Ligand binder design. Structure first.
Ligand SMILES: CCCCCCCCCCCCCCCCCCCCCCCCCC(=O)N[C@@H](CO[C@H]1O[C@H](CO)[C@H](O)[C@H](O)[C@H]1O)[C@H](O)[C@H](O)CCCCCCCCCCCCCC
Ligand SMILES: *[C@@H]1O[C@H](CO)[C@@H](O[C@@H]2O[C@H](CO)[C@@H](O)[C@H](O)[C@H]2NC(C)=O)[C@H](O)[C@H]1NC(C)=O
Ligand SMILES: *[C@@H]1O[C@H](CO)[C@@H](O)[C@H](O)[C@H]1NC(C)=O
Ligand SMILES: *[C@@H]1O[C@H](CO)[C@@H](O)[C@H](O)[C@H]1NC(C)=O
Lengths: 289, 98, 243, 190
């Protein structure tokens, strides 16, 4: 499990700026901190972890000062860059820890390119960073107070709070939802070829196995798609196979998942089930890709 | 600048008539300011709920917008996205076959 | 150290002023401006680090424009003054606490006047010790009186036998208004030199009270009957009596 | 205002103790400074306070700070006459040069001398040049007690006032007629 707090800071001009945050434990969102809101919102019941109200309040106030101080700090340092004040400016922050013994991290990106990180006791510029960053970094490093509490956060507070989230989030981190799969088809970009499509949807946890098969033989032309999210924190995936016409016969999409026991999902092309599924999908085909 | 990737897909096996949930998933864009609408036949669908914006390991943003819908042989759904990296707003149509 | 210029300036209501802050050591580069109003309330104005950084800010009742021209020079143009300000220049390194320090300049006192003909130099008078005081206390006190001047910037000193003395002197903290109800009133200031009776009674002992006054420059237009009131010294003197 | 000092004005006899209060609401409070400004002069740093529960000794000065109560006090043990000044409490916004200072209104300190065996008297002094202008000197009143000068403090230290006026029949005996005057004041005929 990899805990990560993400921060999106937009600086449009001299006056306008916003900053929003989201917190992830694995592939589950735990917190949301909108610019508009004074407090940090919970997205799950177990989002407080094992901390007690007093310990949480202290941390939230710790972050509330941070958000306001950060926005001022950036708008003064921006005056040191080349060229002077290069608006608009985006700042991104990724801070968390990975679980095993643990490993905390804090990385910073400027205009989408990762340039600074916290390491040991100070701020450091990563290889290939703009040379104008040297001056801002020196001033930030002069602030013992920030330096010392960041250290506390990364070294001590991240691992501890996560270890709590993990314990009180176990029930939700263990749940198993069954994949549902269905077949479709599209013309291929090559003449006389067609693209078979196997849609796998509604599964959790994320790890999955999907292949086109001639019984024994896995079809090496299988192209696994990207993992696309569902609104209910489940997952959607598709696998495609490019075939020549009259070669679809005997093919099947196989799906292995932790929620299925050993009982894999097998869907055969042209099978009695597939036919009836297909008759329910029909449509005029516009505007098709 | 990084131009958005738009992917449109249904939550459940898209049988006509039966209620389903349509997802428009936008990826790989920078800066994070972005306007997304989900369209039915051309008119804007009034209640389109959205996830919070997050970013990935390559520092590019991603957001998920979604709404309930009932698919029909004739009715068409799309997803329009306005971003600075684009001159004109990109509109992407749902293709259940894709 | 940190040179602040000019030290003092008269500003005819509705004109600008140029202020400089030349810094002697480049190791303390974080130059910033602080304001202190006539009610002694201090306030931060601007904080500039890079050469070429210019910033604007509007405050009751004076408008500012501060630029950092070079790594050593710091400017501040002050316009549309309604009421008096005094401006302080500070520099520190990156750290400014544990490994200090933070340094303050001598400041620039700006005074705003409506009319120039309102500037008057002070009349000075030394009043000789009381013969009753000498009997009763065996000490002799001279009082000096600087009156009828405007504005309020005067520096007073005592000179016994051609050399300055601090021993036995107490001068008023601030000048007082002669006509208290009026805005363009003139000021008056007093001082006391208290010496032993024996020392005053020496005929060879010479007592002088000088008052430095800060008024007009040689670069101010003036055609009026009374004399042009330049930055000048006015004094009064007395020798001792035996009886 | 974010930094409240109290009181606005304070009076102590030379040699006694004096305490000044400062309550703030600046966030974040990184450090606190005390400054001393002699009237008509620049600021002089008395001490800087850094930690959550801090304390520092500067010879005759001493200050404490509690960040929990956003509160600080300054003590001057055995006060001198030269301690007559304005005392400014200020808060550090950051722990680096990115920070800004926030200043309290100042507490005005007035030190009045310990005059054992006072010698109250009002004398008339005449102009050295002739003539015939004159002035009144009120000397050696203890500090409980027409253009009248505010009472000043000498260093044998004495409280003394000066009054002058240009009016037909002044006169010195009744010059401080709007004043609390000792019942044993010497009024020599002029
Ligand atoms: C952190 C992870 C640990 C896990 C526990 C948290 C889980 C709960 C979920 C929370 C979700 C909220 C989203 C959080 C956003 C992710 C980022 C978190 C890391 C933030 C760093 C924490 C800094 C805290 C210190 C702080 O507020 N500093 C403040 C105040 O400091 C002042 O006040 C203090 C008193 O409170 C001290 O007295 C100090 O001496 C004084 O100067 C100080 O002002 C800092 O400088 C703020 C900046 C920090 C951002 C660094 C950016 C570096 C990149 C610069 C390069 C870009 C180039 C520029 C053009
Ligand atoms: C947080 O952990 C880091 C290591 O990740 C510590 O940084 C070390 O600091 C010590 C002494 O200050 C140095 O000798 C090491 O070289 C540092 N390590 C690295 C990798 O730079 C840091 O001290 C820890 N902070 C706290 C509060 O425990
Ligand atoms: C700052 O940015 C916002 C949004 O980008 C805009 O509405 C506003 O006009 C801008 N202000 C300026 C340019 O002063
Ligand atoms: C974001 O919140 C801050 C208060 O923390 C506010 O001053 C700022 O104007 C807000 N920006 C937007 C775009 O809402």
């Amino acid at each position: 499990y990899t805990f990560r707090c993400l921060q999106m800071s937009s600086f449009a001009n001299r006056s306008w700026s916003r900053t929003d945050s989201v917190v992830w434990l694995g592939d589950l969102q735990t917190h949301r901190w909108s610019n508009d809101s004074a407090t940090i919102s919970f997205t799950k019941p177990w989002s407080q972890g094992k901390l007690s109200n007093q310990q949480w309040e202290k941390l939230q106030h710790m972050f509330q000062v941070y958000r306001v101080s950060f926005t001022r700090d950036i708008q003064e340092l921006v005056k040191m860059m080349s060229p002077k004040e290069d608006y608009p400016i985006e700042i991104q922050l990724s801070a968390g820890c990975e679980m095993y013994a643990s490993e905390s991290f804090l990385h910073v990106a400027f205009q989408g390119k990762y340039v600074v990180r916290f390491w040991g006791t100070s701020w450091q510029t990563v290889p290939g960073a703009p040379s104008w960053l040297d001056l801002p970094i020196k001033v930030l490093n002069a602030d013992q107070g920030t330096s010392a509490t960041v250290q506390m956060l990364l070294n001590d507070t991240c691992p501890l709070f996560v270890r709590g989230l993990l314990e009180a989030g176990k029930s939700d981190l263990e749940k198993q939802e069954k994949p549902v799969a269905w077949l479709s088809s599209v013309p291929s970009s090559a003449h006389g070829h067609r693209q078979l499509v196997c849609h796998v949807s509604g599964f959790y946890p994320k790890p999955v196995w999907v292949m086109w098969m001639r019984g024994d033989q896995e079809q090496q032309g299988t192209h696994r798609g990207d993992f696309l999210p569902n609104a209910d924190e489940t997952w959607y995936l598709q696998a495609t196979l490019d075939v020549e016409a009259g070669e679809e016969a005997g093919l099947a999409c196989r799906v292995k998942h932790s929620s299925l026991g050993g009982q894999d999902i097998i869907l055969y092309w042209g099978s009695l089930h597939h036919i009836l599924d297909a008759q329910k999908m029909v449509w005029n085909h516009r505007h098709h890709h | 600048q990084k131009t958005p990737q738009i992917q449109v897909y249904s939550r459940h096996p898209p049988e006509n008539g039966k209620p389903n949930i349509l997802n428009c998933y936008v990826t790989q864009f920078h800066p994070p300011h972005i306007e997304i609408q989900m369209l039915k036949n051309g008119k804007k669908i009034p209640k389109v709920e959205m996830s919070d914006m997050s970013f990935s390991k390559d520092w590019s943003f991603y957001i998920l917008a979604h709404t309930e819908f009932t698919p029909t042989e004739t009715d068409t759904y799309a997803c329009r996205v306005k971003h600075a990296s684009m001159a004109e707003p990109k509109t992407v149509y749902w293709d259940r076959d894709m | 150290l940190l040179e602040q210029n000019p030290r003092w300036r008269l500003v005819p209501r509705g004109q600008a002023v140029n202020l400089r802050c030349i810094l002697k050591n480049s190791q303390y580069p974080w130059m910033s401006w602080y304001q202190q109003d006539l009610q002694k309330q201090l306030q931060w104005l601007f904080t500039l680090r890079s050469p070429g950084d210019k910033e604007v800010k509007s405050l009751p009742g004076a408008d500012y424009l501060a630029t950092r021209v070079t790594d050593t020079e710091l400017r501040l143009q002050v316009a549309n003054m309604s009421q008096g300000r005094t401006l302080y220049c500070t520099s520190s390194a990156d750290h400014w606490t544990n490994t200090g320090q933070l340094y303050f300049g001598e400041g620039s006192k700006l005074t705003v006047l409506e009319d120039l003909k309102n500037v008057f130099p002070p009349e000075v008078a030394v009043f000789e010790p009381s013969e009753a005081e000498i009997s009763h206390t065996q000490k002799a006190t001279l009082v000096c009186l600087a009156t009828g001047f405007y504005p309020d910037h005067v520096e007073l000193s005592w000179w016994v036998n051609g050399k300055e003395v601090h021993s036995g002197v107490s001068t008023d903290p601030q000048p007082l208004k002669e006509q208290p109800a009026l805005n363009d009133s003139r000021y008056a200031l007093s001082s006391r030199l208290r010496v032993s009776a024996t020392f005053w009674q020496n005929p060879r002992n010479h007592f002088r009270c000088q008052v430095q006054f800060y008024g007009l420059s040689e670069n101010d237009e003036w055609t009026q009957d009374r004399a042009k009131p330049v930055t000048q010294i006015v004094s009064a003197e007395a020798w001792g009596r035996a009886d | 205002t974010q930094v409240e000092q109290s009181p606005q004005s304070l009076v102590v006899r030379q040699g006694e103790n004096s305490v000044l209060q400062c309550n703030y609401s600046v966030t974040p409070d990184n450090h606190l400074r005390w400054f001393k400004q002699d009237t008509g002069k620049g600021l002089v740093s008395l001490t800087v306070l850094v930690d959550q529960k801090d304390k520092t000794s500067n010879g005759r000065y001493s200050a404490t700070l509690d960040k929990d109560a956003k509160h600080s006090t300054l003590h001057i043990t055995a006060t001198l006459l030269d301690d007559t000044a304005t005392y400014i409490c200020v808060v550090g916004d950051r722990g680096s040069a990115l920070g800004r200072l926030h200043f309290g209104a100042g507490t005005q300190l007035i030190v009045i001398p310990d005059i054992q065996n006072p010698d109250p008297a009002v004398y008339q002094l005449r102009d050295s040049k002739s003539s015939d202008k004159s002035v009144c000197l009120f000397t050696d009143f203890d500090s409980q007690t027409v253009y009248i000068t505010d009472k000043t403090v000498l260093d044998f230290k004495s409280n003394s006032a000066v009054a002058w006026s240009n009016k037909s029949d002044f006169a010195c005996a009744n010059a401080f007629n709007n004043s609390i005057i000792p019942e044993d004041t010497f009024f020599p005929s002029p």
